[PDB]
Amino acid sequence: EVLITGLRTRAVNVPLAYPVHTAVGTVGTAPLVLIDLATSAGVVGHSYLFAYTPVALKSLKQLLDDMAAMIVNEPLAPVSLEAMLAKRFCLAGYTGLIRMAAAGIDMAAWDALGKVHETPLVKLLGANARPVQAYDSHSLDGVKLATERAVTAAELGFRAVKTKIGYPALDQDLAVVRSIRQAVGDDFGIMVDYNQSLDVPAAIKRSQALQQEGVTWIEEPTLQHDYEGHQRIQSKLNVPVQMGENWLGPEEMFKALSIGACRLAMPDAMKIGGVTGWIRASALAQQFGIPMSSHLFQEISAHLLAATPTAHWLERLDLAGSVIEPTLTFEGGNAVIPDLPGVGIIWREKEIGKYLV
């Protein structure tokens, strides 16, 4: 019926209103690959990828462009497409940039499929649209900016914020949390994120002090692939350890959950394998008893969380707002899925040319 007829990618470097400072360096702009998936039915699927660093941006575009011949003239059947890519790349390594590229095609193909059936992605997945609580995602901003941004988020109606920590001293971590807490009050979430910057003993010492201060979760305290080390950290805490943005495919999530690395999970729509990977991830989170949040890609994560049995929070970090129309809205701090077929992404074509690499 519906065949894939073309793939077009555009690499952009988009500035951010606030740089994403982390304990391991600053992401000052967002390197994105914008994807269009043309089909024989007249509709075009849209998705985008986040390359994290300009150093990988051109590499990821080139890879996608060389993948185009693998998918042109195949049926628009994302689950069957994913299994084909999984096999074709099983020698090179179906991980990293390659898996990220495969997820970008998956997310565009699902967008295309909802458009074919003139229906929002959440409904094509068999679920009712529902609002999801969102937290406003901040960075390693220093006490002054961290507190201003938390006040502005609370004014916009958000009920929780995330700040990135891992300053040179534990006292600086605690100063930021304490200052946010005094400005937003007790009935407010403060999630904190170390971006893999602590070894396991440091993470136990810092995390127990944060837990005494009162935080909502402690995210990626150590090396993201060290599932055992996260389990050891989690074993010393009442507060939940959060991880998942760096799981490449549901199989990595299965490994982490099988050994108890974390009491929360937050897969990333790209790295987990797109919609197809998210659905599988969501089935694991349910059976392991893990409340499941999103990481980035807030446009598509609104739909996916609505179909997730243990949906927890949506991360509001609008990486692509400069090139995507704001059809996703926030009422009372909850993300509200737009009444649009597919994901609801509409390119801001006038702005894209400003940021092309």
Residue stretches of the annotated binding site: 193, 219, 245, 315
Q: Which residues are annotated as a binding site for Mg(2+)?
A: 193, 219, 245
Q: Which listed range, 19-27, 62-70, 254-262, 340-348, lies at the site for ligand ZMD (CB under 6 A)?
A: 19-27
Q: For residues 198-257, which are near Mg ion according to CB under 5 A?
A: 219, 245
**Token pair 């692939």 in the structure block, residue:** 225
Question: Which partner in ligand ZMD, Mg ion, a second copy, none is near 225 (CB below 5 to 8 A by kind)?
Answer: a second copy
Q: Which two tokens stand for residue 211?
A: 């837990």
Give the list of residues 6+ apart from residue 118 with CB closer than 8 angstroms, or none: 341
- State how far the Cα of 238 lies from the Cα of 144, in Å rounded to an integer: 29
* CA distances (Å), origin 80, targets 18, 35, 206, 254: 39, 19, 45, 22
Asked whether position 27 contacts ligand ZMD by CB under 6 A, the answer is yes
Q: Least separation, in Å, of the C-beta of 189 and ligand ZMD?
A: 15
Q: Least separation, in Å, of the C-beta of 90 and a second copy?
A: 6
Question: Which partner in a second copy, ligand ZMD, Mg ion, none is near 120 (CB below 5 to 8 A by kind)?
Answer: none
Considering only 4, 20, 146, 233, the residue that binds ligand ZMD (CB under 6 A) is 20
> b vs e for 97-123, b when ≥16 Cβ sit within 10 Å of the residue's Cβ?
bbbbbbbbbbbbbbbbbbbbeeebbbb
Asked whether position 193 contacts Mg ion by CB under 5 A, the answer is yes
Q: Which two tokens stand for residue 168?
A: 């040179």
| Number of residues near ligand ZMD (by CB under 6 A) | 13
Question: Which partner in ligand ZMD, Mg ion, a second copy, none is near 317 (CB below 5 to 8 A by kind)?
Answer: ligand ZMD
Helices (H), 3-135: 54-71, 78-88, 96-116, 121-124
Please, what sign has the CA dihedral across residues 187, 188, 189, 190?
Answer: negative
* Chain centroid offset of residue 217 CA: 17
Indicate the residue among 39 and 195 with the shorter CB distance to ligand ZMD. Answer: 195
Q: Least separation, in Å, of the C-beta of 163 and a second copy?
A: 17
Q: Least separation, in Å, of the C-beta of 53 and ligand ZMD?
A: 9
Q: Which listed range, 20-28, 71-79, 98-106, 224-232, lies at the site for ligand ZMD (CB under 6 A)?
A: 20-28
Q: Which residues are annotated as a binding site for substrate?
A: 315
Q: For residues 189-208, which are near ligand ZMD according to CB under 6 A?
A: 193, 195
Helix-strand-coil split of the chain, %, nearest 5: 40, 25, 35
Q: Least separation, in Å, of the C-beta of 282 and a second copy?
A: 8
Pairing state between β 329-331 and 334-336 = antiparallel
Q: For residues 277-296, which are near ligand ZMD according to CB under 6 A?
A: 295-296
Asked whether position 270 contacts ligand ZMD by CB under 6 A, the answer is no
Give the list of residues 6+ apart from residue 25 with CB closer than 8 angstroms, or none: none
Residues that bind ligand ZMD (CB under 6 A): 20, 22, 27, 91, 137, 164, 193, 195, 245, 295-296, 315, 317
